[PDB]
Coordinates of C-alpha atoms and ligand atoms in Angstrom, one line a residue:
Chain A
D2 CA -4.9 5.3 -14.9
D3 CA -5.2 8.5 -12.9
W4 CA -9.2 8.9 -13.5
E5 CA -9.8 5.2 -12.6
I6 CA -12.4 5.5 -9.8
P7 CA -12.2 2.9 -6.8
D8 CA -14.6 0.5 -6.8
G9 CA -17.1 0.7 -4.2
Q10 CA -17.4 4.4 -4.3
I11 CA -19.9 4.1 -6.7
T12 CA -23.9 3.3 -5.7
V13 CA -25.4 2.3 -9.0
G14 CA -28.9 3.3 -9.3
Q15 CA -31.8 2.7 -11.6
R16 CA -31.2 1.4 -15.1
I17 CA -31.8 4.2 -18.0
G18 CA -31.4 2.4 -21.1
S19 CA -29.6 -0.4 -22.8
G20 CA -28.0 -1.2 -26.1
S21 CA -26.0 -4.5 -27.7
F22 CA -23.1 -3.2 -25.8
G23 CA -24.3 -2.8 -21.9
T24 CA -26.3 -0.6 -19.8
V25 CA -26.4 3.1 -18.7
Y26 CA -27.6 3.6 -15.2
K27 CA -28.1 6.4 -12.6
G28 CA -25.6 6.7 -10.1
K29 CA -24.4 8.5 -6.7
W30 CA -20.6 9.1 -6.4
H31 CA -20.0 12.5 -4.9
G32 CA -23.2 13.8 -6.2
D33 CA -25.0 12.6 -9.6
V34 CA -23.4 10.5 -12.3
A35 CA -24.5 8.4 -15.1
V36 CA -22.9 5.1 -15.5
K37 CA -22.1 3.4 -18.9
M38 CA -21.4 -0.1 -18.1
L39 CA -20.1 -2.7 -20.7
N40 CA -21.6 -5.8 -19.3
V41 CA -18.5 -7.7 -20.5
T42 CA -18.0 -10.6 -18.1
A43 CA -14.5 -11.3 -18.6
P44 CA -12.9 -8.7 -21.1
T45 CA -10.2 -10.0 -23.2
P46 CA -6.7 -7.8 -23.3
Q47 CA -7.6 -6.5 -26.5
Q48 CA -10.9 -5.2 -25.4
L49 CA -9.4 -3.6 -22.3
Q50 CA -6.8 -1.9 -24.7
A51 CA -9.8 -0.4 -26.9
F52 CA -11.6 0.8 -23.7
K53 CA -8.7 2.4 -22.9
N54 CA -8.5 4.0 -25.8
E55 CA -11.7 5.3 -25.7
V56 CA -11.3 6.7 -22.2
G57 CA -8.3 8.2 -24.2
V58 CA -10.5 10.2 -26.6
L59 CA -12.9 11.5 -23.6
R60 CA -10.4 12.0 -21.2
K61 CA -9.5 15.2 -23.7
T62 CA -12.5 16.9 -23.5
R63 CA -13.5 19.7 -21.3
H64 CA -16.1 21.9 -22.3
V65 CA -19.3 22.9 -20.8
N66 CA -21.6 21.7 -24.0
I67 CA -19.7 18.3 -24.3
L68 CA -21.1 15.5 -21.5
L69 CA -18.5 15.8 -18.8
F70 CA -16.1 12.6 -18.4
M71 CA -15.6 12.2 -14.6
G72 CA -14.0 8.6 -14.4
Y73 CA -13.5 5.0 -15.3
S74 CA -13.8 1.8 -13.8
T75 CA -12.5 -1.7 -15.1
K76 CA -12.3 -3.9 -12.1
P77 CA -15.6 -5.8 -12.1
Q78 CA -17.1 -4.5 -15.5
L79 CA -15.6 -1.7 -17.9
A80 CA -17.6 1.4 -17.2
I81 CA -17.7 5.0 -18.0
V82 CA -18.7 7.5 -15.5
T83 CA -20.0 11.1 -16.7
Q84 CA -21.9 13.8 -15.0
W85 CA -25.7 13.1 -14.4
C86 CA -28.0 15.3 -16.5
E87 CA -31.4 16.6 -15.5
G88 CA -34.2 16.8 -18.0
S89 CA -34.4 15.1 -21.5
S90 CA -32.8 14.6 -24.8
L91 CA -33.4 17.1 -27.6
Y92 CA -35.1 14.4 -29.5
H93 CA -37.7 13.7 -26.5
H94 CA -38.0 17.9 -26.3
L95 CA -38.9 18.4 -30.2
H96 CA -40.7 15.3 -31.0
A97 CA -42.4 13.3 -28.1
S98 CA -43.2 16.3 -25.9
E99 CA -46.1 18.6 -25.5
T100 CA -44.2 21.9 -24.6
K101 CA -42.2 23.6 -27.7
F102 CA -39.5 26.0 -27.8
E103 CA -39.4 29.4 -28.7
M104 CA -37.2 30.6 -32.0
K105 CA -34.7 32.3 -29.4
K106 CA -34.3 28.8 -27.5
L107 CA -33.9 27.1 -30.6
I108 CA -31.4 29.4 -31.7
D109 CA -29.5 29.2 -28.4
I110 CA -29.8 25.4 -28.5
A111 CA -28.1 25.6 -32.3
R112 CA -25.6 27.6 -30.8
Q113 CA -24.7 25.6 -28.1
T114 CA -24.1 22.4 -30.2
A115 CA -22.4 24.2 -32.3
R116 CA -19.9 25.5 -29.7
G117 CA -19.2 21.8 -28.7
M118 CA -19.0 20.3 -31.8
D119 CA -16.4 23.2 -33.2
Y120 CA -14.5 22.4 -29.8
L121 CA -14.4 18.8 -30.7
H122 CA -12.8 19.3 -34.3
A123 CA -10.8 21.9 -33.0
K124 CA -9.6 18.7 -31.1
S125 CA -9.8 16.7 -34.0
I126 CA -12.5 14.5 -32.4
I127 CA -14.9 13.1 -34.6
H128 CA -18.5 12.7 -33.2
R129 CA -19.8 10.2 -35.9
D130 CA -23.6 9.9 -34.2
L131 CA -24.4 13.4 -33.5
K132 CA -28.4 13.1 -33.5
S133 CA -31.0 15.3 -31.8
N134 CA -31.4 12.0 -29.2
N135 CA -27.6 12.5 -28.4
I136 CA -28.1 16.0 -27.1
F137 CA -28.8 15.9 -23.7
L138 CA -30.8 19.3 -22.3
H139 CA -29.2 19.6 -19.0
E140 CA -31.9 21.5 -16.6
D141 CA -33.3 21.9 -19.8
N142 CA -31.1 25.1 -20.6
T143 CA -27.7 23.6 -21.3
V144 CA -26.6 21.5 -24.0
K145 CA -24.2 18.5 -23.5
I146 CA -23.4 16.3 -26.4
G147 CA -22.9 13.3 -25.9
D148 CA -23.2 9.0 -26.9
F149 CA -20.3 9.3 -29.5
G150 CA -20.6 7.2 -32.5
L151 CA -18.6 4.4 -32.7
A152 CA -15.1 4.6 -34.5
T153 CA -14.5 1.9 -37.0
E154 CA -10.8 2.2 -36.7
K155 CA -8.7 -0.6 -35.3
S156 CA -7.6 0.8 -32.7
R157 CA -11.0 1.6 -30.7
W158 CA -13.9 -0.1 -29.6
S159 CA -15.8 -1.9 -32.5
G160 CA -13.1 -1.7 -35.0
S161 CA -11.1 -4.0 -32.6
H162 CA -14.1 -6.7 -32.6
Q163 CA -14.2 -6.1 -36.0
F164 CA -10.7 -6.7 -36.8
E165 CA -10.5 -9.8 -34.3
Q166 CA -13.4 -11.6 -35.1
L167 CA -12.1 -11.4 -39.1
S168 CA -8.5 -11.5 -38.4
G169 CA -8.0 -15.0 -39.1
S170 CA -10.4 -15.3 -42.0
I171 CA -9.1 -12.7 -44.7
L172 CA -7.8 -15.9 -46.2
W173 CA -11.4 -16.9 -47.1
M174 CA -12.3 -13.3 -47.9
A175 CA -14.1 -12.5 -51.6
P176 CA -12.3 -9.3 -52.9
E177 CA -15.7 -7.7 -52.6
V178 CA -15.6 -8.5 -48.8
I179 CA -11.9 -7.3 -48.2
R180 CA -12.8 -4.0 -50.0
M181 CA -15.4 -3.2 -47.5
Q182 CA -13.1 -4.3 -44.5
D183 CA -11.4 -0.9 -44.4
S184 CA -14.1 2.0 -44.9
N185 CA -14.5 4.5 -42.5
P186 CA -17.1 7.5 -44.3
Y187 CA -16.7 9.6 -40.9
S188 CA -14.9 13.0 -41.6
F189 CA -15.6 16.4 -40.1
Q190 CA -17.8 17.5 -43.0
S191 CA -20.1 14.2 -42.1
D192 CA -20.3 15.3 -38.6
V193 CA -21.1 18.9 -40.5
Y194 CA -23.7 17.1 -42.3
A195 CA -25.5 15.5 -39.2
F196 CA -25.5 19.2 -37.8
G197 CA -27.6 20.2 -40.8
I198 CA -30.1 17.8 -39.7
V199 CA -29.8 18.7 -36.2
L200 CA -30.7 22.5 -37.2
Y201 CA -33.7 21.0 -39.6
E202 CA -35.2 19.7 -36.3
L203 CA -34.9 22.8 -34.3
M204 CA -36.3 25.1 -37.1
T205 CA -39.2 22.8 -38.5
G206 CA -39.9 20.7 -34.9
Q207 CA -39.8 17.7 -37.5
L208 CA -37.7 14.9 -38.5
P209 CA -36.1 14.8 -42.2
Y210 CA -38.5 12.9 -44.8
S211 CA -41.6 12.3 -42.7
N212 CA -43.0 11.3 -46.1
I213 CA -40.7 8.5 -46.7
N214 CA -41.6 5.5 -44.3
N215 CA -38.9 3.0 -45.7
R216 CA -35.5 3.1 -44.5
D217 CA -34.7 1.4 -47.9
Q218 CA -35.4 4.1 -50.2
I219 CA -34.0 7.3 -47.8
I220 CA -30.8 5.3 -48.2
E221 CA -31.2 5.1 -52.0
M222 CA -32.7 8.5 -52.6
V223 CA -30.2 10.1 -49.9
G224 CA -27.3 8.2 -50.9
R225 CA -28.0 8.1 -54.7
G226 CA -27.9 12.2 -54.5
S227 CA -31.6 12.9 -55.3
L228 CA -33.3 13.6 -51.9
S229 CA -32.6 15.9 -49.3
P230 CA -34.7 17.7 -46.6
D231 CA -37.9 19.8 -47.3
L232 CA -36.6 23.7 -46.3
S233 CA -40.2 24.8 -47.0
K234 CA -40.8 23.3 -43.6
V235 CA -39.0 25.5 -41.4
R236 CA -41.1 27.4 -39.4
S237 CA -42.2 31.2 -40.0
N238 CA -40.1 32.9 -37.7
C239 CA -36.7 31.1 -38.7
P240 CA -34.4 33.7 -39.6
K241 CA -33.3 33.2 -43.4
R242 CA -29.9 33.2 -42.5
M243 CA -30.5 30.0 -40.3
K244 CA -32.0 28.3 -43.6
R245 CA -28.9 29.5 -45.8
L246 CA -26.7 28.1 -43.0
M247 CA -28.9 24.8 -43.2
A248 CA -28.5 24.5 -46.6
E249 CA -24.7 24.9 -46.7
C250 CA -24.3 22.1 -44.1
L251 CA -26.8 19.6 -45.9
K252 CA -24.9 20.0 -49.3
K253 CA -24.4 16.4 -50.7
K254 CA -20.9 16.6 -51.9
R255 CA -19.0 16.2 -48.8
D256 CA -16.2 18.7 -49.5
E257 CA -18.5 21.6 -50.0
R258 CA -19.8 22.0 -46.5
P259 CA -18.6 24.8 -44.0
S260 CA -16.2 24.1 -41.3
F261 CA -17.4 24.4 -37.4
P262 CA -15.3 27.6 -36.7
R263 CA -17.3 29.0 -40.0
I264 CA -20.7 27.4 -38.7
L265 CA -20.3 28.9 -35.0
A266 CA -19.5 32.6 -35.7
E267 CA -22.6 32.7 -38.1
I268 CA -24.9 31.5 -35.6
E269 CA -23.6 33.5 -32.8
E270 CA -23.9 36.7 -35.3
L271 CA -27.5 36.0 -36.3
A272 CA -28.3 35.4 -33.0
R273 CA -27.9 39.1 -32.1
Chain B
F1 CA -38.6 -21.5 -28.6
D2 CA -38.9 -22.2 -24.8
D3 CA -38.7 -25.6 -25.7
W4 CA -34.9 -25.5 -26.5
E5 CA -33.6 -24.2 -23.4
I6 CA -31.6 -26.2 -20.8
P7 CA -32.3 -25.5 -16.9
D8 CA -29.2 -24.1 -15.1
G9 CA -27.5 -27.1 -13.4
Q10 CA -28.2 -30.0 -16.1
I11 CA -25.0 -29.6 -18.3
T12 CA -21.3 -30.3 -16.6
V13 CA -19.1 -28.2 -18.5
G14 CA -15.4 -29.7 -18.9
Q15 CA -12.5 -28.9 -20.7
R16 CA -11.9 -25.4 -22.4
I17 CA -11.6 -25.7 -26.1
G18 CA -11.0 -21.8 -27.2
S19 CA -11.9 -18.3 -26.0
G20 CA -12.3 -15.1 -27.9
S21 CA -13.7 -12.1 -26.4
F22 CA -17.4 -12.9 -27.7
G23 CA -17.6 -16.4 -26.4
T24 CA -15.9 -19.2 -24.8
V25 CA -16.2 -22.9 -26.3
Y26 CA -16.1 -26.0 -23.5
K27 CA -16.6 -29.5 -23.9
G28 CA -19.5 -30.5 -21.7
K29 CA -21.7 -33.2 -20.7
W30 CA -25.6 -33.3 -21.2
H31 CA -26.8 -37.0 -22.1
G32 CA -23.7 -37.3 -23.5
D33 CA -20.8 -35.3 -24.8
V34 CA -21.9 -31.8 -25.9
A35 CA -20.0 -28.5 -26.7
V36 CA -20.8 -25.5 -24.9
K37 CA -20.4 -21.9 -26.5
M38 CA -20.7 -19.3 -23.6
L39 CA -20.9 -15.8 -24.4
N40 CA -19.1 -13.3 -22.7
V41 CA -21.9 -11.3 -21.5
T42 CA -23.1 -10.9 -17.5
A43 CA -26.9 -10.1 -16.9
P44 CA -27.9 -9.6 -20.7
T45 CA -29.9 -6.4 -21.6
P46 CA -33.3 -6.6 -23.4
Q47 CA -31.8 -5.9 -26.7
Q48 CA -29.0 -8.1 -26.2
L49 CA -31.6 -11.2 -25.4
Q50 CA -33.7 -10.1 -28.5
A51 CA -30.4 -10.6 -30.7
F52 CA -29.7 -13.7 -28.9
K53 CA -33.0 -15.3 -29.4
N54 CA -33.1 -14.2 -32.7
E55 CA -29.6 -15.8 -33.5
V56 CA -31.0 -19.2 -31.8
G57 CA -33.9 -18.8 -33.5
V58 CA -31.3 -19.3 -37.5
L59 CA -29.6 -22.2 -35.5
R60 CA -33.2 -23.7 -34.9
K61 CA -33.6 -23.7 -38.8
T62 CA -30.9 -25.9 -39.6
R63 CA -31.1 -30.1 -39.3
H64 CA -28.8 -31.3 -41.8
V65 CA -26.1 -34.1 -41.1
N66 CA -23.0 -31.8 -42.2
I67 CA -24.5 -28.6 -40.2
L68 CA -23.2 -28.5 -36.6
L69 CA -26.1 -30.2 -34.9
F70 CA -27.9 -27.1 -32.5
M71 CA -29.2 -28.9 -29.1
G72 CA -30.5 -26.2 -27.1
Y73 CA -29.4 -23.4 -24.8
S74 CA -29.6 -21.9 -21.5
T75 CA -30.0 -18.6 -20.1
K76 CA -28.5 -19.2 -16.5
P77 CA -25.9 -19.8 -15.3
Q78 CA -25.1 -17.9 -18.3
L79 CA -26.0 -17.1 -22.0
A80 CA -24.9 -20.5 -23.7
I81 CA -25.4 -22.4 -27.2
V82 CA -25.2 -26.3 -26.8
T83 CA -24.5 -28.3 -29.8
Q84 CA -23.6 -31.8 -30.7
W85 CA -19.7 -32.9 -29.6
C86 CA -17.2 -33.7 -32.6
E87 CA -14.7 -36.1 -32.3
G88 CA -11.3 -35.5 -34.1
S89 CA -10.0 -32.4 -35.6
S90 CA -11.2 -29.7 -37.9
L91 CA -10.1 -29.8 -41.5
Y92 CA -7.8 -27.2 -41.1
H93 CA -5.8 -29.2 -38.9
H94 CA -6.0 -31.9 -40.9
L95 CA -4.5 -30.5 -44.1
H96 CA -2.1 -27.9 -42.1
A97 CA -0.8 -29.5 -39.2
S98 CA -0.9 -33.4 -39.5
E99 CA -0.3 -33.8 -43.3
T100 CA -2.8 -36.7 -42.9
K101 CA -2.8 -36.8 -46.6
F102 CA -6.4 -37.7 -47.0
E103 CA -5.6 -39.6 -50.3
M104 CA -7.5 -37.7 -53.0
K105 CA -10.8 -39.9 -52.9
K106 CA -11.8 -38.4 -49.6
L107 CA -10.2 -35.3 -50.5
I108 CA -13.3 -35.1 -52.6
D109 CA -15.9 -36.6 -50.1
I110 CA -15.0 -33.8 -47.7
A111 CA -15.6 -31.2 -50.5
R112 CA -19.0 -33.1 -51.1
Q113 CA -19.9 -33.1 -47.8
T114 CA -19.0 -29.4 -47.4
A115 CA -21.1 -28.6 -50.2
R116 CA -24.1 -30.4 -49.3
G117 CA -24.2 -28.4 -45.9
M118 CA -23.7 -25.4 -48.0
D119 CA -26.1 -25.9 -50.2
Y120 CA -28.5 -26.4 -47.4
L121 CA -27.6 -23.6 -45.8
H122 CA -28.3 -21.4 -48.9
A123 CA -31.5 -22.9 -49.4
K124 CA -32.0 -22.3 -46.1
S125 CA -31.5 -18.5 -46.8
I126 CA -28.7 -18.5 -44.2
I127 CA -25.3 -16.9 -45.3
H128 CA -22.2 -18.5 -43.1
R129 CA -20.0 -15.5 -43.0
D130 CA -17.1 -17.0 -42.3
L131 CA -16.5 -20.3 -44.0
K132 CA -13.2 -21.8 -43.4
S133 CA -11.3 -24.9 -42.6
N134 CA -11.1 -24.0 -39.0
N135 CA -15.1 -24.0 -39.3
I136 CA -15.0 -27.4 -40.9
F137 CA -15.1 -30.2 -37.9
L138 CA -14.2 -33.4 -39.4
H139 CA -16.5 -35.6 -36.8
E140 CA -15.1 -39.3 -36.2
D141 CA -12.8 -38.4 -39.3
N142 CA -15.5 -38.8 -41.7
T143 CA -18.7 -36.4 -41.5
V144 CA -18.1 -32.6 -42.2
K145 CA -19.6 -30.6 -39.5
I146 CA -19.8 -26.8 -41.1
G147 CA -19.7 -24.7 -37.7
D148 CA -19.2 -20.9 -36.3
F149 CA -21.4 -18.7 -38.3
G150 CA -20.9 -15.2 -38.1
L151 CA -22.6 -11.9 -37.9
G169 CA -31.5 4.3 -36.2
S170 CA -29.5 7.2 -37.3
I171 CA -30.1 6.8 -41.1
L172 CA -32.0 10.4 -41.1
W173 CA -28.4 12.1 -39.9
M174 CA -26.2 10.3 -41.9
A175 CA -24.3 12.5 -44.9
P176 CA -24.8 10.9 -48.5
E177 CA -21.0 9.1 -48.3
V178 CA -22.2 7.6 -44.8
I179 CA -25.5 6.5 -45.8
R180 CA -24.2 4.9 -48.5
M181 CA -22.1 2.2 -46.7
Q182 CA -25.4 1.4 -45.2
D183 CA -26.1 0.2 -48.4
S184 CA -23.4 -2.1 -49.0
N185 CA -22.8 -5.3 -46.9
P186 CA -20.1 -7.6 -49.3
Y187 CA -21.4 -10.7 -47.5
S188 CA -24.0 -12.9 -50.2
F189 CA -24.6 -16.3 -51.2
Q190 CA -21.4 -15.5 -53.8
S191 CA -18.9 -14.4 -51.1
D192 CA -19.9 -18.0 -49.5
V193 CA -19.1 -19.3 -53.0
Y194 CA -15.7 -17.8 -53.0
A195 CA -14.9 -18.7 -49.2
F196 CA -16.0 -22.6 -50.4
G197 CA -13.7 -22.2 -53.4
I198 CA -10.8 -21.6 -50.8
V199 CA -10.9 -24.5 -49.2
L200 CA -11.0 -26.2 -52.3
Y201 CA -7.8 -25.1 -52.9
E202 CA -6.6 -26.2 -49.6
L203 CA -8.1 -29.6 -50.4
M204 CA -6.4 -29.7 -53.7
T205 CA -3.2 -28.2 -52.8
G206 CA -2.7 -29.1 -49.1
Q207 CA -2.0 -25.6 -48.6
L208 CA -3.2 -22.3 -47.7
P209 CA -3.3 -19.4 -50.5
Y210 CA -0.4 -17.0 -50.8
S211 CA 2.0 -19.0 -48.9
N212 CA 4.7 -17.1 -50.1
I213 CA 3.8 -13.8 -49.4
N214 CA 3.0 -13.7 -45.8
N215 CA 1.8 -10.5 -45.2
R216 CA -2.1 -9.4 -44.1
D217 CA -1.9 -5.8 -45.1
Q218 CA 0.0 -7.0 -48.7
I219 CA -2.9 -9.7 -48.9
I220 CA -5.6 -7.7 -48.4
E221 CA -4.7 -4.9 -50.7
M222 CA -4.0 -6.8 -53.6
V223 CA -6.8 -9.4 -53.2
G224 CA -9.4 -6.4 -52.4
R225 CA -8.3 -4.9 -55.6
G226 CA -7.6 -7.9 -58.1
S227 CA -4.0 -8.3 -58.5
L228 CA -3.4 -11.5 -56.2
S229 CA -5.5 -14.6 -56.4
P230 CA -4.5 -18.2 -55.3
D231 CA -1.8 -19.8 -57.1
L232 CA -3.6 -22.4 -58.8
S233 CA -0.1 -23.7 -60.1
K234 CA -0.2 -25.7 -56.7
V235 CA -3.2 -28.2 -56.9
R236 CA -1.7 -31.6 -57.1
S237 CA -1.2 -33.5 -60.0
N238 CA -4.0 -36.0 -59.0
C239 CA -6.6 -33.7 -58.7
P240 CA -9.5 -33.8 -61.2
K241 CA -9.3 -30.8 -63.4
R242 CA -13.3 -31.0 -63.4
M243 CA -13.0 -29.3 -59.8
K244 CA -9.9 -27.9 -60.6
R245 CA -12.0 -25.7 -63.1
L246 CA -14.8 -25.9 -60.3
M247 CA -12.4 -24.4 -57.8
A248 CA -11.4 -21.5 -60.7
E249 CA -14.9 -20.8 -61.1
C250 CA -16.0 -20.2 -57.0
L251 CA -12.9 -17.8 -57.0
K252 CA -14.0 -15.5 -59.6
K253 CA -13.2 -12.0 -58.5
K254 CA -16.3 -10.8 -59.7
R255 CA -18.9 -12.1 -57.6
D256 CA -21.6 -12.4 -60.3
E257 CA -19.4 -14.8 -62.4
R258 CA -19.6 -17.2 -59.2
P259 CA -21.7 -20.7 -59.3
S260 CA -24.3 -21.4 -56.8
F261 CA -24.2 -24.2 -54.8
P262 CA -26.9 -26.0 -56.3
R263 CA -25.0 -26.4 -59.3
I264 CA -21.5 -26.7 -57.2
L265 CA -23.0 -29.5 -55.5
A266 CA -24.5 -31.4 -58.8
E267 CA -21.1 -30.8 -59.9
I268 CA -19.1 -32.1 -57.3
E269 CA -21.4 -35.0 -56.9
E270 CA -21.1 -36.0 -60.8
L271 CA -17.5 -36.3 -60.7
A272 CA -17.1 -38.6 -57.4
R273 CA -18.9 -41.0 -59.5
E274 CA -16.0 -41.8 -61.4
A275 CA -13.7 -43.3 -58.4
Ligands
LIG1 N1 -29.2 11.6 -17.6 C1 -27.7 11.6 -18.3 N2 -26.6 11.8 -17.8 C2 -25.9 11.7 -18.4 C3 -25.6 10.6 -19.9 C4 -26.9 9.8 -19.7 C5 -27.1 9.1 -21.0 S1 -28.8 8.8 -21.5 C6 -28.2 7.6 -23.0 C7 -29.1 7.1 -23.8 C8 -30.6 6.9 -23.4 O1 -31.1 5.9 -24.1 C9 -30.6 4.4 -23.5 C10 -29.2 4.6 -23.0 N3 -28.4 5.6 -24.0 N4 -26.7 7.7 -22.3 C11 -26.2 8.2 -21.7 C12 -24.5 8.2 -21.4 C13 -24.2 8.0 -20.3 C14 -22.5 7.8 -20.3 C15 -22.0 8.2 -21.6 C16 -22.6 8.2 -23.0 N5 -22.1 8.7 -24.2 S2 -20.6 9.0 -23.9 O2 -19.8 8.4 -25.3 O3 -20.0 7.2 -23.6 C17 -19.4 9.9 -23.1 C18 -18.7 9.6 -22.1 C19 -17.8 10.6 -21.3 F1 -17.3 10.2 -20.3 C20 -18.0 12.2 -21.9 C21 -18.6 12.3 -22.8 C22 -19.3 11.7 -23.5 F2 -20.1 11.6 -24.9 C23 -23.8 8.7 -22.8 F3 -25.0 8.9 -23.9 N6 -27.9 10.3 -19.2
LIG2 N1 -15.5 -30.7 -30.9 C1 -16.1 -29.6 -31.1 N2 -17.4 -30.1 -31.5 C2 -18.5 -29.0 -32.0 C3 -17.9 -27.9 -31.8 C4 -16.8 -27.6 -31.3 C5 -16.1 -26.0 -31.6 S1 -14.6 -25.7 -31.8 C6 -14.8 -24.3 -32.0 C7 -13.5 -23.0 -32.3 C8 -12.1 -23.7 -32.5 O1 -11.2 -22.8 -32.4 C9 -11.2 -22.3 -31.1 C10 -12.5 -22.7 -30.2 N3 -13.3 -22.2 -31.1 N4 -16.1 -23.8 -32.0 C11 -17.1 -24.8 -31.9 C12 -18.3 -24.7 -31.7 C13 -19.0 -24.7 -30.5 C14 -20.5 -24.4 -30.5 C15 -21.3 -23.6 -31.6 C16 -20.2 -23.3 -33.1 N5 -21.0 -23.1 -34.1 S2 -22.2 -22.0 -34.1 O2 -22.3 -20.9 -34.9 O3 -22.4 -21.5 -32.8 C17 -23.5 -23.2 -34.4 C18 -24.3 -23.4 -32.9 C19 -25.5 -24.5 -33.7 F1 -26.3 -24.4 -32.3 C20 -25.5 -25.1 -34.6 C21 -24.8 -24.9 -35.5 C22 -23.5 -23.9 -35.3 F2 -22.6 -23.7 -36.4 C23 -18.8 -23.7 -32.9 F3 -18.5 -23.6 -33.9 N6 -15.8 -28.3 -31.2

């Protein structure tokens, strides 16, 4: 309640993108800011609590490669206020842009996002949706990890709506639906895997399985355990140490991936 | 699709009937009585509108006496869906707060009408996802209206996470099971697991197959043919469960005996 921004201080600007949740707009508040709004008309007490909890998570981050939480509102609509990034997503640079990156820059980007992720796990925060689209290249040299995935727990945003809209329905739930209620596949190791995919894009310039245009076989083959990215797609000058690190983060069996403190030492060392 | 929108001002919103963080339901006037379900959305984005136009699309596919009648929708003053107004109470209210004691004859009729509507939805490839006696409105105390349906990172998903994208427990058979539960409360007049009363316990025990509705409680004058139908819908293994075409044909053949 210390970070609540009084209303009428922010001048909301141009919409930058939307979602099933709401909208992100550029804004003016002691300078440039991004504003993530939940366009809920009349949030429920439980929706408000789940919002406080997400703000609880964000306010414990303070690191240069994590998008900076600056404040939150609840007065008109639920809102989260962050620093404003200039430039584009890492996805846009790698995949939708003419200009490509030197190897030394790619490794530096890999290093910055390992620092952020190492910082998150040190603080027991799982990102849950790490992808190159969620890595903003601020001023086109500073990684800012943002757009935290939706936590499944009954104390966070999505889990509160999942647990609220099925709270009074369990008596009618087939066993197979019950079992799927409480799930959560997300871990530190799952974060590490996504990071391996982010490395795959940096070091190849492409998205994995660009050769499998079916959401359904990817799901079956990667899930089933027989399909993993094509590492012979890494560029000529990718260091073999970077390739080895990659294969380790991408191991199919979850408890076989490395932790981020080890991941980080490795990249800073090889950047040499 | 543009031909089912109701322009701003035509609907007169009355008593609030029920809230929730996704929407609120009102009684309204529009060429008579209607129910207005307001979505808790202010100025919907592109993607929320396409989600909305997509779900109205499903509701636009239903025309059946036992399916709550879709009548229209609005985008201002707010996103809303408009349906017929049902007179009376839900089935849940009747069984568990009125003790109306619908003599068996009607208990079966209600189960016939509910199976009629479910067979219709399934024949349209619509899974309800939340069938229960709260969502079965007993219009004028005679007609069943089933209402209240429920509902780009795979490249970055580890095998264990990508597996969950491949599940979805909601199927024609989980609708059948929920129908089996409604049957249980018609024929016992009681909710399952009354004795237990601990959501965590029930979640854990049903999910693993140690706990099942105590069929010892179906009343004495309950036709055991549909006591056996109840038991078939409630099979823990979802593939051991019957389809609605067969559920309906069965439940309509015992109603002849009256
Ligand atoms: N230029 C610029 N600058 C900054 C952000 C953005 C965009 S662009 C976009 C994408 C773009 O496509 C359509 C909308 N989605 N999202 C943000 C943004 C905005 C707010 C929050 C988050 N993520 S967060 O979990 O809420 C978070 C909150 C917090 F307090 C601290 C750390 C966090 F990680 C965001 F991803 N842009
Ligand atoms: N008296 C009376 N009459 C009729 C309805 C209701 C109530 S009461 C209630 C619950 C009661 O408990 C607390 C308040 N909420 N809901 C409706 C209602 C209102 C609108 C839609 C739906 N379901 S639907 O998916 O959106 C749908 C939309 C559609 F177009 C066609 C078929 C559909 F199934 C509804 F369940 N009441």
